[PDB]
């Protein structure tokens, strides 16, 4: 499923991401936009053989099991395919573990390179939250 930007913002707020660990809602919407273009089915292979899954492009080396990433952890205790659901609950809860890991949202290359230091709240203007 491809989200609308306000529809995603509403869903992320419902699941408690707004100001989670100090990151306002605009950061999470901006990250999703540049990681996946709001597409829950987005997958991307990495050079080391791991794969990124879902709206926040969560990686199979550490956070989920896809059965083809040898010597990998499953810290969110889910199959990676669960991150492709139009229900974003698993993606959001796993992201809550990731952002608490220590590096914050710098864990997402796209957020750091494309959202950090910008007017992220522009991503929720006009939305009815």
Q: Pick out the residues of the known binding site for substrate.
A: 101
In a domain, 88, yes or no: yes
In a domain, 74, yes or no: yes
Range of the domain at 63: 5-124
CA proximity to 123, closest of 39, 7, 41, 16:
7
Question: What sign does the CA torsion over 71, 62, 87, 108 have?
Answer: negative
In a domain, 129, yes or no: no
The count of domains in the chain is 1
Dist CA 31 CA 34 (whole Å): 5
Q: Of 7, 35, 66, 119, which is the active-site residue?
A: 35
Pseudo-torsion of CA 81, 61, 118, 33, nearest 10°?
Answer: -20
CA proximity to 56, closest of 39, 68, 74, 73:
39
- Asked if 52 is an active-site residue, the reply is yes
- Asked if 35 is an active-site residue, the reply is yes
In a domain, 106, yes or no: yes
Q: Across the strands, what pairs with 58?
A: 53
3-state SS, one letter per residue, for the chain: CECCHHHHHHHHHHCCCCCECCECHHHHHHHHHHHHCCECCCEEECCCCCEEECCCCEECCCCCECCCCCCCCCCCCCEHHHHHCCCCHHHHHHHHHHHCCCCHHHHCHHHHHHCCCCCHHHHHCCCCC
Q: In this structure, what CATH number is given to the domain that contains residue 15?
A: 1.10.530.10
State this model's resolution in angstroms: 2.4
State the distance between the two ends of the chain, measured CA to CA, in whole angstroms: 21
Q: Of 7, 18, 48, 52, which is the active-site residue?
A: 52
User: What is the CB neighbour count within 10 angstroms for residue 64?
Assistant: 29
In a domain, 55, yes or no: yes
In a domain, 99, yes or no: yes
Q: Across the strands, what pairs with 38?
A: none
**Experimental determination approach used:** X-ray
């Amino acid at each position: 499923k491809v989200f609308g930007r306000c529809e995603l913002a509403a869903a992320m707020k419902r699941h408690g991401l707004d100001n989670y660990r100090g990151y306002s809602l605009g950061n999470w919407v901006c990250a999703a936009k540049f990681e996946s273009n709001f597409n829950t089915q987005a997958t991307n292979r990495n050079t080391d053989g791991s794969t990124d899954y879902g709206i926040l492009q969560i990686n199979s080396r550490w956070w989920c099991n896809d059965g083809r990433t040898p010597g990998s952890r499953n810290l969110c205790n889910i199959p990676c395919s669960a991150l492709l659901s139009s229900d974003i609950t698993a993606s959001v809860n796993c992201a809550k573990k990731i952002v608490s890991d220590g590096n914050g949202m710098n864990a997402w290359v796209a957020w750091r390179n494309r959202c950090k230091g910008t007017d992220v709240q522009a991503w929720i203007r006009g939305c009815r939250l």
